Structure formats: C-alpha cells, structure tokens
C-alpha cells in the first residue's frame, strides 16, 4: 500500500542520518589522530636532534681527553728529567764540601 512505500522511505531517511553522523564522527577521529601524530612527531624530532647534539659534544670531549692525557704523559716524563737534574746538582755541591774537608 501507499503507506508502506512511505514507511520504507522513513526507515531509509533515518539510516542516512545515522550513517552521515557516523562518518562525521570517524572523520573527527581521523583529524584528531593526525594532530596527535604531529605532536609525537615534533616531540621525536626534537629528542633526536638533542641526542645528536649531546653525542657530538661527546666527540669534543673525546678529543680533549685524548690530547689531555698526551700532555699529562709529556709532563710526567719532564718531571723525571728535572728531578734528575736536581739530584745531580745536589751531588755537585756535596763534592764541593768534600773539597772543604780537604
């Protein structure tokens, strides 16, 4: 009957509304998902670039530690040659005293 055609049409209207809103909701879920991403992205980019910067400053620290221990070693050897020069001067004076007792 005429009325039945009506009834279908109404059922179908309601479906369109349910499906339209449902789609809209999903889309919003997408937009918010994109945004959340972008946040995590920027956050990661900055964490990386940091890790890099610290590791490079570490490269610097390695270089200066290496040269620094080189200089340390050099100085040590010079302290030995100089403590030597000292002792030898002491002995020189001692022999001068051996002359005094003469």
39 binds Ni ion (CB under 5 A): yes
Chain breaks in the chain (C to N over 2.5 A) after: none
87 binds other proteins (CB under 8 A): no
Site for other proteins in 29-58 (CB under 8 A): 29-30, 32-37, 40-41, 43-44, 47-48, 50-51, 54-55, 57-58
Radius of gyration of the chain (CA): 44
18 binds Co ion (CB under 5 A): yes
DSSP string, 16-52: HHHHHHHHHHHHHHHHHHHHHHHHHHHHHHHHHHHHH
- Cα 57 to the center of its chain, rounded Å: 10
46 binds a copy of itself (CB under 8 A): yes
CB under 8 A: which stretch of 21-29, 42-50, 82-90, 94-102 binds a copy of itself? Answer: 42-50
Binding interface with Ni ion (CB under 5 A): 39
Binding interface with other proteins (CB under 8 A): 2, 5, 8-9, 12-13, 15-17, 19-30, 32-37, 40-41, 43-44, 47-48, 50-51, 54-55, 57-58, 61-62, 64-65, 68-69, 71-72, 75-76, 78-79, 82-83, 85-86, 89, 92-93, 96, 100
């Amino acid at each position: 009957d005429y009325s039945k055609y009506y009834k279908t049409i109404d059922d179908l209207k309601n479906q369109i509304l349910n499906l339209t809103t449902d789609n809209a909701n999903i889309l919003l879920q997408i937009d918010n998902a994109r945004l959340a991403a972008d946040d995590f992205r920027l956050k990661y980019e900055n964490e990386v670039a940091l890790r890099q910067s610290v590791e490079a400053d570490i490269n610097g620290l390695r270089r200066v530690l290496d040269e620094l221990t080189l200089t340390k070693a050099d100085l040590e050897m010079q302290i030995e040659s100089l403590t030597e020069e000292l002792a030898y001067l002491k002995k020189n004076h001692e022999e001068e005293m051996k002359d005094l007792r003469n």
